PDB file of C-alpha atoms (C1' of nucleotides) in Angstrom:
ATOM      1  CA  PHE A 350     -22.798  14.099 -25.521  1.00 38.30           C
ATOM      2  CA  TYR A 351     -19.853  15.296 -23.713  1.00 39.18           C
ATOM      3  CA  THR A 352     -16.004  15.776 -24.375  1.00 44.36           C
ATOM      4  CA  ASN A 353     -15.742  14.870 -20.505  1.00 41.93           C
ATOM      5  CA  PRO A 354     -18.412  12.491 -19.588  1.00 41.45           C
ATOM      6  CA  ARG A 355     -16.577  11.237 -16.321  1.00 40.30           C
ATOM      7  CA  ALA A 356     -16.186  15.082 -14.939  1.00 40.13           C
ATOM      8  CA  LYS A 357     -18.753  15.721 -12.058  1.00 35.08           C
ATOM      9  CA  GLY A 358     -18.891  20.025 -12.858  1.00 32.96           C
ATOM     10  CA  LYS A 359     -19.875  21.816 -15.916  1.00 36.14           C
ATOM     11  CA  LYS A 360     -20.091  19.213 -19.287  1.00 37.61           C
ATOM     12  CA  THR A 361     -19.585  20.768 -22.619  1.00 39.22           C
ATOM     13  CA  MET A 362     -21.173  19.120 -25.352  1.00 42.88           C
ATOM     14  CA  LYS A 363     -19.569  17.265 -28.305  1.00 44.03           C
ATOM     15  CA  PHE A 364     -21.702  17.181 -31.028  1.00 43.94           C
ATOM     16  CA  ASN A 365     -22.941  20.042 -33.238  1.00 44.46           C
ATOM     17  CA  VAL A 366     -26.290  19.174 -34.796  1.00 43.11           C
ATOM     18  CA  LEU A 367     -28.915  16.738 -32.480  1.00 42.72           C
ATOM     19  CA  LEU A 368     -31.631  15.407 -34.703  1.00 44.70           C
ATOM     20  CA  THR A 369     -34.978  14.207 -32.765  1.00 46.22           C
ATOM     21  CA  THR A 370     -37.989  13.730 -32.880  1.00 45.47           C
ATOM     22  CA  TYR A 371     -41.430  14.614 -31.300  1.00 45.70           C
ATOM     23  CA  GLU A 372     -41.834  11.531 -29.179  1.00 44.72           C
ATOM     24  CA  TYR A 373     -38.258  11.920 -27.517  1.00 46.73           C
ATOM     25  CA  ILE A 374     -38.676  15.693 -27.242  1.00 45.39           C
ATOM     26  CA  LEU A 375     -41.702  14.676 -25.073  1.00 43.44           C
ATOM     27  CA  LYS A 376     -40.238  11.475 -23.389  1.00 41.54           C
ATOM     28  CA  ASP A 377     -36.724  13.362 -22.721  1.00 41.62           C
ATOM     29  CA  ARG A 378     -37.687  16.885 -21.977  1.00 40.81           C
ATOM     30  CA  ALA A 379     -35.747  16.598 -18.560  1.00 40.60           C
ATOM     31  CA  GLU A 380     -32.354  15.428 -20.394  1.00 39.37           C
ATOM     32  CA  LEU A 381     -32.764  17.728 -23.275  1.00 39.10           C
ATOM     33  CA  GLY A 382     -34.400  20.906 -22.053  1.00 39.48           C
ATOM     34  CA  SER A 383     -31.243  21.555 -19.342  1.00 36.39           C
ATOM     35  CA  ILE A 384     -29.062  22.268 -22.635  1.00 33.20           C
ATOM     36  CA  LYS A 385     -28.078  25.801 -23.577  1.00 30.92           C
ATOM     37  CA  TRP A 386     -29.090  25.415 -27.403  1.00 30.05           C
ATOM     38  CA  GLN A 387     -28.091  28.019 -29.793  1.00 31.35           C
ATOM     39  CA  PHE A 388     -30.690  27.180 -32.536  1.00 29.24           C
ATOM     40  CA  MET A 389     -33.893  25.047 -32.785  1.00 26.19           C
ATOM     41  CA  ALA A 390     -35.186  23.997 -36.260  1.00 25.49           C
ATOM     42  CA  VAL A 391     -38.777  22.425 -36.383  1.00 26.98           C
ATOM     43  CA  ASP A 392     -39.754  20.536 -39.670  1.00 28.39           C
ATOM     44  CA  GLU A 393     -43.824  19.955 -40.243  1.00 31.75           C
ATOM     45  CA  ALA A 394     -44.799  23.016 -37.947  1.00 34.80           C
ATOM     46  CA  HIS A 395     -48.377  22.119 -38.249  1.00 37.02           C
ATOM     47  CA  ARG A 396     -47.826  19.494 -35.808  1.00 36.47           C
ATOM     48  CA  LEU A 397     -47.233  22.780 -33.513  1.00 34.27           C
ATOM     49  CA  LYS A 398     -50.077  24.240 -34.403  1.00 38.65           C
TER      50      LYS A 398
ATOM     51  C1'  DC B   1     -75.827 -46.253  28.282  1.00 42.77           C
ATOM     52  C1'  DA B   2     -74.472 -50.197  24.985  1.00 42.75           C
ATOM     53  C1'  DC B   3     -73.648 -51.800  20.196  1.00 41.36           C
ATOM     54  C1'  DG B   4     -72.712 -51.581  15.882  1.00 40.96           C
ATOM     55  C1'  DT B   5     -71.185 -50.057  11.336  1.00 41.21           C
ATOM     56  C1'  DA B   6     -70.564 -45.998   7.921  1.00 41.42           C
ATOM     57  C1'  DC B   7     -67.945 -42.610   6.920  1.00 42.96           C
ATOM     58  C1'  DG B   8     -63.438 -39.179   8.196  1.00 41.87           C
ATOM     59  C1'  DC B   9     -59.077 -39.756   7.398  1.00 41.76           C
ATOM     60  C1'  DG B  10     -54.727 -41.435   6.173  1.00 45.76           C
ATOM     61  C1'  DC B  11     -51.859 -43.695   2.548  1.00 41.59           C
ATOM     62  C1'  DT B  12     -50.545 -44.695  -2.126  1.00 40.52           C
ATOM     63  C1'  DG B  13     -50.755 -44.829  -7.181  1.00 40.50           C
ATOM     64  C1'  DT B  14     -51.252 -41.837 -11.581  1.00 37.28           C
ATOM     65  C1'  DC B  15     -52.231 -39.302 -14.717  1.00 36.55           C
ATOM     66  C1'  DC B  16     -53.171 -34.491 -16.112  1.00 36.42           C
ATOM     67  C1'  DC B  17     -53.303 -30.192 -16.462  1.00 34.69           C
ATOM     68  C1'  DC B  18     -51.428 -26.021 -14.948  1.00 32.53           C
ATOM     69  C1'  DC B  19     -46.870 -23.560 -14.166  1.00 34.62           C
ATOM     70  C1'  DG B  20     -42.625 -21.976 -15.718  1.00 33.29           C
ATOM     71  C1'  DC B  21     -39.962 -20.031 -19.430  1.00 30.24           C
ATOM     72  C1'  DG B  22     -38.741 -18.432 -24.022  1.00 28.64           C
ATOM     73  C1'  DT B  23     -40.457 -16.166 -28.181  1.00 30.98           C
ATOM     74  C1'  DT B  24     -43.483 -13.538 -31.528  1.00 25.87           C
ATOM     75  C1'  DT B  25     -47.457 -10.555 -31.874  1.00 24.25           C
ATOM     76  C1'  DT B  26     -50.347  -6.885 -30.804  1.00 23.55           C
ATOM     77  C1'  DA B  27     -52.942  -3.564 -29.076  1.00 23.54           C
ATOM     78  C1'  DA B  28     -52.874  -0.316 -24.993  1.00 21.99           C
ATOM     79  C1'  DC B  29     -51.773   3.855 -24.164  1.00 23.54           C
ATOM     80  C1'  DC B  30     -50.101   8.819 -24.957  1.00 23.40           C
ATOM     81  C1'  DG B  31     -50.559  12.332 -28.113  1.00 25.20           C
ATOM     82  C1'  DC B  32     -53.174  14.349 -32.142  1.00 29.13           C
ATOM     83  C1'  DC B  33     -57.385  16.482 -35.117  1.00 28.56           C
ATOM     84  C1'  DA B  34     -62.152  17.790 -36.864  1.00 31.43           C
ATOM     85  C1'  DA B  35     -66.607  19.581 -35.563  1.00 31.58           C
ATOM     86  C1'  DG B  36     -70.797  19.110 -32.703  1.00 29.90           C
ATOM     87  C1'  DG B  37     -73.729  17.972 -29.197  1.00 28.38           C
ATOM     88  C1'  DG B  38     -74.760  17.666 -23.668  1.00 29.46           C
ATOM     89  C1'  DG B  39     -74.670  19.239 -19.816  1.00 31.87           C
ATOM     90  C1'  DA B  40     -73.386  22.490 -15.654  1.00 34.87           C
ATOM     91  C1'  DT B  41     -73.916  27.134 -14.066  1.00 34.07           C
ATOM     92  C1'  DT B  42     -76.096  32.225 -13.885  1.00 32.73           C
ATOM     93  C1'  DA B  43     -79.867  34.948 -14.483  1.00 32.05           C
ATOM     94  C1'  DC B  44     -84.624  36.030 -15.781  1.00 30.80           C
ATOM     95  C1'  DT B  45     -89.902  35.356 -16.729  1.00 29.87           C
ATOM     96  C1'  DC B  46     -94.042  32.804 -15.968  1.00 28.14           C
ATOM     97  C1'  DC B  47     -98.120  30.331 -14.431  1.00 26.22           C
ATOM     98  C1'  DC B  48     -99.505  25.963 -12.453  1.00 28.36           C
ATOM     99  C1'  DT B  49    -100.098  23.446  -8.561  1.00 30.11           C
ATOM    100  C1'  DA B  50     -99.740  22.046  -3.822  1.00 29.80           C
ATOM    101  C1'  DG B  51    -100.095  23.787   0.678  1.00 29.76           C
ATOM    102  C1'  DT B  52    -103.549  26.077   3.966  1.00 32.86           C
ATOM    103  C1'  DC B  53    -107.633  26.778   6.043  1.00 32.51           C
ATOM    104  C1'  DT B  54    -112.840  26.316   6.656  1.00 32.57           C
ATOM    105  C1'  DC B  55    -116.364  22.971   6.814  1.00 33.13           C
ATOM    106  C1'  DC B  56    -119.002  18.883   6.341  1.00 32.78           C
ATOM    107  C1'  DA B  57    -120.140  13.872   5.550  1.00 33.30           C
ATOM    108  C1'  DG B  58    -119.343   8.977   4.840  1.00 30.00           C
ATOM    109  C1'  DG B  59    -115.742   5.307   5.784  1.00 28.54           C
ATOM    110  C1'  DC B  60    -114.090   2.640   9.412  1.00 26.71           C
ATOM    111  C1'  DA B  61    -114.505   0.464  13.496  1.00 28.19           C
ATOM    112  C1'  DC B  62    -117.248  -1.793  16.959  1.00 27.78           C
ATOM    113  C1'  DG B  63    -120.659  -3.515  18.648  1.00 25.29           C
ATOM    114  C1'  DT B  64    -124.792  -6.680  18.062  1.00 24.26           C
ATOM    115  C1'  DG B  65    -129.004  -9.308  16.033  1.00 27.54           C
ATOM    116  C1'  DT B  66    -130.286 -12.657  12.882  1.00 26.29           C
ATOM    117  C1'  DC B  67    -129.694 -15.967   9.237  1.00 25.46           C
ATOM    118  C1'  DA B  68    -128.177 -19.564   6.456  1.00 23.60           C
ATOM    119  C1'  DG B  69    -125.622 -23.961   5.510  1.00 23.65           C
ATOM    120  C1'  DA B  70    -123.097 -27.503   8.597  1.00 24.34           C
ATOM    121  C1'  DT B  71    -123.309 -30.733  12.808  1.00 26.09           C
ATOM    122  C1'  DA B  72    -125.996 -33.386  15.830  1.00 25.87           C
ATOM    123  C1'  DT B  73    -129.903 -36.016  17.498  1.00 24.40           C
ATOM    124  C1'  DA B  74    -135.453 -38.329  17.671  1.00 28.17           C
ATOM    125  C1'  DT B  75    -138.429 -41.300  15.720  1.00 27.57           C
ATOM    126  C1'  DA B  76    -140.251 -44.232  11.960  1.00 25.51           C
ATOM    127  C1'  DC B  77    -139.782 -48.240   8.122  1.00 25.47           C
ATOM    128  C1'  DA B  78    -137.131 -52.164   6.229  1.00 24.08           C
ATOM    129  C1'  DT B  79    -134.639 -55.915   7.812  1.00 21.54           C
ATOM    130  C1'  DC B  80    -131.366 -60.289   9.976  1.00 21.21           C
ATOM    131  C1'  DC B  81    -131.206 -64.135  13.594  1.00 21.15           C
TER     132       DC B  81
END
DNA sequence: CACGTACGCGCTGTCCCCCGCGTTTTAACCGCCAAGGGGATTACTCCCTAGTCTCCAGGCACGTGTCAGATATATACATCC
């Protein structure tokens, strides 16, 4: 995730695109909600109906 | 209180079955429709039925006299020594 994982201040991201599923959005909303995302792309949005 | 003996308890063997562990499966759990019925409230209307009241009469309780079945004698006929 981070270019500097051994730091303790502000950690900037290393990856560009994160592919994930619904189950790990619900499971890891704490570890993923505290990320300033620039874009969301939700495939099969009828699940989000 | 005396006697005596049966059984509670301790010890030992033995075998068997339950526990611990590793591996594989599998269904509980969480998150989803898809519509529809059950049920909890809020408000309203209506009507049947149970409380209340008055009056009376017979059911229940008590007491007492009798009465038919069960029990205990009174006297007469049959019978043993």
